[PDB]
Amino acid sequence: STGSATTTPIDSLDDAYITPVQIGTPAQTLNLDFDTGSSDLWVFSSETTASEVDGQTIYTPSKSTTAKLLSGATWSISYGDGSSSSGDVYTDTVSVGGLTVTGQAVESAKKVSSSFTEDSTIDGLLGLAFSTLNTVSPTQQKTFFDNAKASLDSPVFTADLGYHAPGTYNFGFIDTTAYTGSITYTAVSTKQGFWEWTSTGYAVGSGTFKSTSIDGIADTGTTLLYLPATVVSAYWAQVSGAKSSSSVGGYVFPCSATLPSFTFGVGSARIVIPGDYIDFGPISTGSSSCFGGIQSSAGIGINIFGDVALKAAFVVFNGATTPTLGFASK
Numbered sequence: 001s002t003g004s005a006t007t008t009p010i011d012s013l014d015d016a017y018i019t020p021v022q023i024g025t026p027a028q029t030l031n032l033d034f035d036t037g038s039s040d041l042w043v044f045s046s047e048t049t050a051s052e053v054d055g056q057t058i059y060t061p062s063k064s065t066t067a068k069l070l071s072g073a074t075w076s077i078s079y080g081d082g083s084s085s086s087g088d089v090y091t092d093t094v095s096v097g098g099l100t101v102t103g104q105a106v107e108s109a110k111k112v113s114s115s116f117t118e119d120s121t122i123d124g125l126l127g128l129a130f131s132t133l134n135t136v137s138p139t140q141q142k143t144f145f146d147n148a149k150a151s152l153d154s155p156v157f158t159a160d161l162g163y164h165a166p167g168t169y170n171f172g173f174i175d176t177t178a179y180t181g182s183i184t185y186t187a188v189s190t191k192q193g194f195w196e197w198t199s200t201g202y203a204v205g206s207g208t209f210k211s212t213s214i215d216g217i218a219d220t221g222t223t224l225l226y227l228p229a230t231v232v233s234a235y236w237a238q239v240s241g242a243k244s245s246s247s248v249g250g251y252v253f254p255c256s257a258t259l260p261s262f263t264f265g266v267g268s269a270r271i272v273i274p275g276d277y278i279d280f281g282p283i284s285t286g287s288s289s290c291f292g293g294i295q296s297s298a299g300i301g302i303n304i305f306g307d308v309a310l311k312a313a314f315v316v317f318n319g320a321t322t323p324t325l326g327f328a329s330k
């Protein structure tokens with residue numbers, strides 16, 4: 001089996017991407033944020049505290065003939081941005097782009113934090129990190145990918161995110177028309193439950209490549225690129241007037257600037273992020289200070305190759321017995 005679904009930016013800045021997912025019988029279609037940095041499939045639902053729902057489409061398990069309460073199971077998750085959600089659990093049929101899993105754990109939110117409430121376009125998350133991070137208690141549950149894997153033609157999924165445009169998540173096959181050149185594969189550590197790998201270095205604009213190991217995670221659920229302070233300082237030093245603002249919460253730059261590209265290494269290969277991908281626009285409406293798409297990971301505790309980096313590549317999440325990550329230019 002295979003699946004193929006289009007993923008669409010939620011706004012003009014590519015703050016996140018949503019992908020339609022069919023849950024239950026008859027199908028209830030919810031738009032979920034596919035998140036390779038977490039391992040819970042959770043949804044706004046008929047159980048979500050009413051005051052915490054503002055425009056989202058909800059899953060109603062009582063209207064699904066295939067829904068079953070997973071008795072006694074609860075879940076609770078906190079994300080790196082300080083947001084959170086929690087609730088109870090149903091099993092139901094879940095389909096993504098024509099690929100169907102029966103008996104998938106669908107985590108029904110009873111509570112969500114304010115940033116979820118405020119994002120009317122995101123009806124929940126579909127986690128694609130390793131199932132060891134799943135928060136369901138007392139019986140940990142598997143991700144959609146882990147449940148699908150045995151049925152897939154090949155034990156892989158791919159992320160092909162667009163810059164200010166739709167893109168694609170494929171399951172079970174590599175679309176050889178979706179990238180240019182060859183795919184470079186690199187080792188993954190699953191020790192922390194993430195798609196964790198080591199970049200071989202970086203360059204700023206047309207500058208020389210600095211060979212240096214940068215351990216980080218491939219995280220489709222994080223908007224920006226978070227790298228060590230040394231690397232980030234070297235980047236923003238090339239932008240006149242750029243500075244780190246404690247009041248804003250990161251590097252800002254004059255909206256009149258032309259940003260340099262940023263290159264990261266994957267083995268002996270190189271992925272180039274165009275300067276425009278690093279522009280996240282005015283910090284507040286009408287401001288001439290613009291927010292940067294490359295930020296320091298100091299204080300996070302991990303480097304994060306989020307959408308700014310991933311959307312510059314065709315990315316293979318290889319879930320074979322020894323997992324690996326592949327990157328190609330596109």
Ligand SMILES: CNCc1cc([N+](=O)[O-])ccc1Cl
Nearest residue numbers: 033035037079080081221222
């Ligand atoms: C865990 N990956 C990043 C993240 C993703 C989301 N998401 O809605 O997809 C929310 C918070 C964070 Cl910190």
